Amino acid sequence: FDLENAVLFEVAWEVANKVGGIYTVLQTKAKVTGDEWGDNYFLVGPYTEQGVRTQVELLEAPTPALKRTLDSMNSKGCKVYFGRWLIEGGPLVVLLDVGASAWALERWKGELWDTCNIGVPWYDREANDAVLFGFLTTWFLGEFLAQSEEKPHVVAHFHEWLAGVGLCLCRARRLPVATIFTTHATLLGRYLCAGAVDFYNNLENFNVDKEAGERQIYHRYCMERAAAHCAHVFTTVSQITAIEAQHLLKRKPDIVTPNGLNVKKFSEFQNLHAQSKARIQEFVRGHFYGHLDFNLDKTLYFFIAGRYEFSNKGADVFLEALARLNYLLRVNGSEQTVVAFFIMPARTNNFNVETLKGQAVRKQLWDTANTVKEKFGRKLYESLLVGSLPDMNKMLDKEDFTMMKRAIFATQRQSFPPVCTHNMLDDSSDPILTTIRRIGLFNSSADRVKVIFHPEFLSSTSPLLPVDYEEFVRGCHLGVFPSYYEPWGYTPAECTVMGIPSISTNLSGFGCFMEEHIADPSAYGIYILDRRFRSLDDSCSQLTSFLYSFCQQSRRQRIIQRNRTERLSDLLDWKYLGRYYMSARHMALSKAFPEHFTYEPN
Amino acid sequence: FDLENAVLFEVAWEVANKVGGIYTVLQTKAKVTGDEWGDNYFLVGPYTEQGVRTQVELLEAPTPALKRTLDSMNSKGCKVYFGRWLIEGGPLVVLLDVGASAWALERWKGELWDTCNIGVPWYDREANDAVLFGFLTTWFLGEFLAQSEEKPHVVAHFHEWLAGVGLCLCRARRLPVATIFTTHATLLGRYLCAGAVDFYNNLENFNVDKEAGERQIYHRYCMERAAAHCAHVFTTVSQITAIEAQHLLKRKPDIVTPNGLNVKKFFQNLHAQSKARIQEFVRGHFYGHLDFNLDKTLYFFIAGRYEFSNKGADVFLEALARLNYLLRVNGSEQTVVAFFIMPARTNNFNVETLKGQAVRKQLWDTANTVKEKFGRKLYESLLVGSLPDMNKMLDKEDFTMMKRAIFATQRQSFPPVCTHNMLDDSSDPILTTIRRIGLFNSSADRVKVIFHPEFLSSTSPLLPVDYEEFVRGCHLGVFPSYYEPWGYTPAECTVMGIPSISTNLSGFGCFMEEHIADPSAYGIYILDRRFRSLDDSCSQLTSFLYSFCQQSRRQRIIQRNRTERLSDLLDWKYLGRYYMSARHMALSKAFPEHFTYEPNE
Amino acid sequence: MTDQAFVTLTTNDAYAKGALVLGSSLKQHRTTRRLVVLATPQVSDSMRKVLETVFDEVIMVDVLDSGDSAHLTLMKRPELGVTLTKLHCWSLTQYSKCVFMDADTLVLANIDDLFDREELSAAPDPGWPDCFNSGVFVYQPSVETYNQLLHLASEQGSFDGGDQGILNTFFSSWATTDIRKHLPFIYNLSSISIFSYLPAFKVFGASAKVVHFLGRVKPWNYTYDPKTKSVKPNMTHPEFLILWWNIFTTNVLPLLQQFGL
Lengths: 602, 601, 261
Known about the structure:
3 chains; A: about 50% helix; C: 11 strands; transferase; Metabolism Glycogen synthesis Glycogen synthase Glycogenin; Glycogen [starch] synthase, muscle
C-alpha cells in the first residue's frame, strides 16, 4: 500500500525503441504507474539514437545517490544515459546502451554460464543483445543499492523474455530486491501454434524441451523459463497466456495482469463514425464503379486488421465464414451487402491499375457532377431571378450533355472489381487471395459479400482511403478478429475503446478477458467465438451465425449496440487495470524479505 | 394506431403569420406530423395578406369534401382560402380570414356568452380576432363533417389561447372531434413573473381569478382556462409550464409535449472558424488594450429578448463580477469575455467600437502587405540560393506602413462595454448593472463584458456574423432565466455543440434534468433557481462559471462534444412522440369505440 | 456426411488397384464423405473383398444384364460399355451430391472443397480447354439426368467415343456459363499438362491437390522398386507416381494378401 523506500524499475527492451506492442504497453503504463510510484519510477531500457532524440529529453540525476550510480556506470566503459521520456506522466528513464559490449563476450557471457548454466549462441542477435542488457541492468540496480543508503524496498519489473536475463542474475547475485517478471507472450507458444497441428488442446502433452530444441530456439526458451522460475511473482497478460505458461513454462502465473490502453480516442463517437463511413463509402463507390447495383446505405463494412498472420489472426475462419454469409444473403434476398476489408500488411508494389482507375473515375464523375451542378446553380439562380420555376429540360446545355455522356461512358465496365487494392509483388503465394478464389468471393454482381484486401497500413499519404487506421476503424460497422493464438488483442482492444463492436475468441486474451468480465458478451456488442472448445468447422459455422445475426440486426438495434460498446472502454482503461499490477507489485515485496512490508490480499 | 380515417387539424394563430415562437414550433412540427397523418394534416390558421403572398401557395382542395366546405363558407359572407404552406413537409393550410367575418362578430360574441359565458371586451383586438378565428374554425370542422358523407374522426390540436375559443365551442356543439389544447406558456405566468415579487413559490397562494381581474386580462384568462378544462387532452410545453398550469389554468397536463427543434442547424472546423472571427472582433474592440492572452480567453454569451428579469441577466452579471474576483485573486491567464447579444434601442455603432474594428482592419492590411512583400522577397532569395538576410527583407517602405499601424493602436481609454451607443443609456438595466458590478473592461479585470444591443446579423457592418455562426464560436452559453416556458435560445445552443447553462425554471433545463441523470457531464449545467434564493443561485452560477473556467483544453472539448450528442433529445424525430401520444390519447378519450381508439398507457 | 460421396469406377482388377489407391488417399487426407466404388461384374470376387476394406459401398453394375437400365442403350452402342457403366454414377440417388473420380487419380490434399461446387463442375481439359476432363467432376445424382444421358448416348453417342465426349455434349454450358463451374486444374492435374508446359508445373505444381495419370502406361502398370521407392512418360514429376506406389505398398498389399492375391 505505502512505499517508504520502494523504487519502481520497469525493465523492458521496449522502453525507448519501438520494436513491438510491448512498447505501446510501457508508453501507456507509464502514466498510471507514474502516480503510484511518484519520482521513484525509473524505466530501464536500451539506448537507440533515433529513439532518444525524438522521444527523450536528456536530464541530470534527481538524487545524489543516483548521480554516483550514473558516474560509476559511465566510468567502467559503459555509456548509460539518463533522461525524461516525453510521454504522458514524464517518467525518469535510465536508457543504458547495449553498444557498450566491451567485455560481453567471454566475460559477461562467461559469468552467465557459471551463474545460470545458460549459454547464448553467437549468431542469435536478440539474445546476444539481451544478455548485455540484462547484465547491465543487474549491475545498475546492484550498484545503486550499494552506493545509496540501502533501500530494502525497490521493485524491478521485467516486461519481456529478453529483459529476463537481468532477473535471472539479480536473484542469483542475492540482491535484496523483489523482482516481477511478466511474459506478454509465451516464446514457445508462438512457434508451436501454426508450427504444430493442434497447439491448444495438446498443451499438456507437448514435451516443451524437445519442441524448443527442434526449433533452434532453445536458448531463448530456457531464458524465458528461467526468468519465470526466478521471479518471486510471475505475471501473464491474459488467462489464455496463463494456461500456456502453466504447461510450457511449467509455472503457474502467480497473478494475471491484463494489458490496458488509455482513452485518447476522444478528440464525436457517432459524428466520427458517420464521417469515417462517408470516406469509406467514397472508396467503395470508386472501387466498384459500374457494378453499383448494391444499396450503398444498406451496405455494412466488416474489417480484420493487425500484423500479417493467416493462421494466428484466423483470416481463414473469417473468409470461410464470409462465403457462408454470402450463401445466406443470396438464398434469402437482402438489400444489405457486406464489404469485408482485410487490412493485413503484405508486400506491395503499387496500387493496382484497375483500383487506381476506379478511384480516378469516381474523381472524374464527382468533378463532372460539380461542373454540371455549378452550371445548374447559375441557370437556376438566373431563372429564379426572373420569377419562373426552372424549365428542367432547358437547364442542361448541349455542352454538358456531351461531358456527362463521356462520364457515363467511362463508368461502363463488364469486369468485376479486383479483390485486392494493391498490385502484389507476390500474388500466387498470397494466402488471402488463394482462399478468396477458392471460397468463390470474386466480387461478382450476384454476390452479396464483397472482399477488398488492402495489404498496406492505411496512411494519410496513400491516394486511396487516405485515412489513418483509427479513422478507418471508426468508419467500419463491425470488426472481426477470430484470433487463434495472438495473446493480447491490441487491435480488438483499440476497436472496442473506439466503440466498434468486435468479434473476439476464447483463444484471444482480450476475448477471454471479456468473457470473465462480461456476463453476456453479445449484449454489449463484443461477440465471443468459442474456438478453444469447438472444432474448426463448427467455429466457422459459429462465426457465420454471429455475422448473419449482425447483418439481420435492425438499424436502431445496431446503433444501440455501438453505444453499448462505448461503455466497455472502462474495462480496458489503465485506471481500472492499474489495480492488477499494483496488486502484483505489493505481492512481490511480501514474497521475499516480508518483515519490512507485509500487506494482505483483498 | 388506426389513423386511416382520422384528420389532423392543428388550429393555431401563427399558422402563417410569424407572431411568435409558436410559429417556429409549427413550422418545425409540420414535417414529422406530416408523415403520421399523411395528407389529412391541415393547419387551420389566420389569414394575413403578407402570409399568402410570400409563404402560402394557392391550390385546389385535394379531397371533394373540403371543396364543398370551403365553398359553403366562401358563399356565406366569409372568406376561407386553401393552400400549401411552402415550409418543409408542404402541410396543407386552410387560412380563415378574421377580417372578412367581422360582420358577424356581434353574433359570434352573443353565442359565446350563451355557450361558454366568456364575454370578450370590445377594445381587445387580439381576443376579438381570436373569437372570430375560433368561431370560424368550429364552423370549418362542422362543415367538413357535414359535407363528408363517410364521416371521418377529426383531431383538432389547438396550440394557444388564441385558438382556445374553438375548443370551447367545438366541445359544446358536440361535433365528433377529438380536441387537444396546448398552452405553450401560461397567460397569467408572464404577467405574474414580472409583476409579483415571488411568482414561483407562491403559485399555490395565488388566486388566478383575483389576479387576472386585477391585470384586466381576465377574458383572455377565462378563455385559456375554459379551453384547458374543455380539451380532451390538455398538454403543456414543459414540466415547469405544467407546474404553472396545475396552479393557474387548474387542469394538470395529461402529457408534456416539449417544443423540439428540427436539427437543420447542423462541427469542430466550424467552431474554430467562428472562434477566429470572434477573436478578430475582440482584437478590434480592445484597440491596444490587448494585454490578455486570446488563446486562453473564453467567450460566454446570453441571447434572447431584452428581458432583465425573465432571462435573469442580473444573475449572469452578478455572477460575472464574482468570477472576475475569483479569477483575479487566484492565478489566471484565462480571461472571460461575456457577450450579451440582447436587442435594445441602438442608434449606431459607438465611435470607439467602429474605430477599433477599423484599426484591426488596418493592422491586418499592413501585416498582410508586409507579409506578402516578405514572402516574395524570401521566395526570390531562396531561389538565388542565398539564405534571407532578415534585416534586409523589410524595406524602409515597410517600416513606414508598420510605424503608422503601431501609431494607430495607441489608446488610453478602456474599451467600451457596449458596442452600440444607446438612445437611452441611464435606463438600460444591463449598463446600470455593469457599472455597479465594476466591469469597465479595465486592464486589471479578468472578465470583460461586451453588450451587443442589436441581434447579430450578416447585414451588420462591424460583424457580418449570423447568430448561428457567433453561437458556434463561443465556449459556453449562460441562460439563467426566471420565466422561460421553453427556452428556445438554450435549445438552439444545445443543438449546436455549445454547452449551455440553463435553469430548473427553464423548459430546456427542466427537460434535460428529467431526461439525463447526470446533467453536468453532458455540458448542460442546471442552475437551480426553483428551490434556491436569488443570491444563493448567483453563488451557484459563479461556481458553475468558475468550474468551466478551471477546465483544461482537452476536458472542455469533451464537454462540447457530449453536448452535440444531446441534440437528438431536442430534435422533432424523437420529440414528436410526446405530441403523437397526445393525439392518440385524444382519439382514445372521445369516440372510444370506433376503430382501434384505445390508449396503450 | 452420409448424404455426400466420392464415387469411382472399377471395370477390372487392374483398375481396382487404382481405386484402392485413390480410396486410401482420400482416407489419408481425412474426407468426411462416403467412398462408393462402382464395380462391373468383371471384378473378381476376391478383389471385391479387398475393395470392401477401403470403400463404404461396393455397388455392382452389369450393363450386360437385361435388367440393367442401360442395357437397351448398350445394344444400340456396343462400343460404349465402359461409358454406360460410368454414367450409372447418376443413378446413386441415395446421395444429394457426389464427386466422381476416375480410378487413375490420386489425392494429395483434402478436397472436400469440391462439394462446394454444383453440378458438372470439372477441371478444364489439357488439349481442348473447352471440354471438361471427366476425371474429376461434381454432379448431383438424378434418374432424369441419367435417362437424358442414355438418350444422348443412343442418339448421338460421344464425339470422343468415351464418357468425356457424351458428358461434354450434354453439359456444353460449362465452357461459357459460369466460372464457379470451372474447377482449378490443381483439382485435376493431368500429368500431360505438367509435361507439355513444365514451367507452369514448377510454379503451380506445389499446390497440386489431385494428380490424374492420363498416359499409355497406367500407375499400376509402372514397375516399382521398394528399395528406394523407385520407378522405372508425361510423369515428369515422378514424385506423384512415387506417392502412388508408396500408398499402395503401405496401405493395400496388407488388405490385398488378407483377401487373396
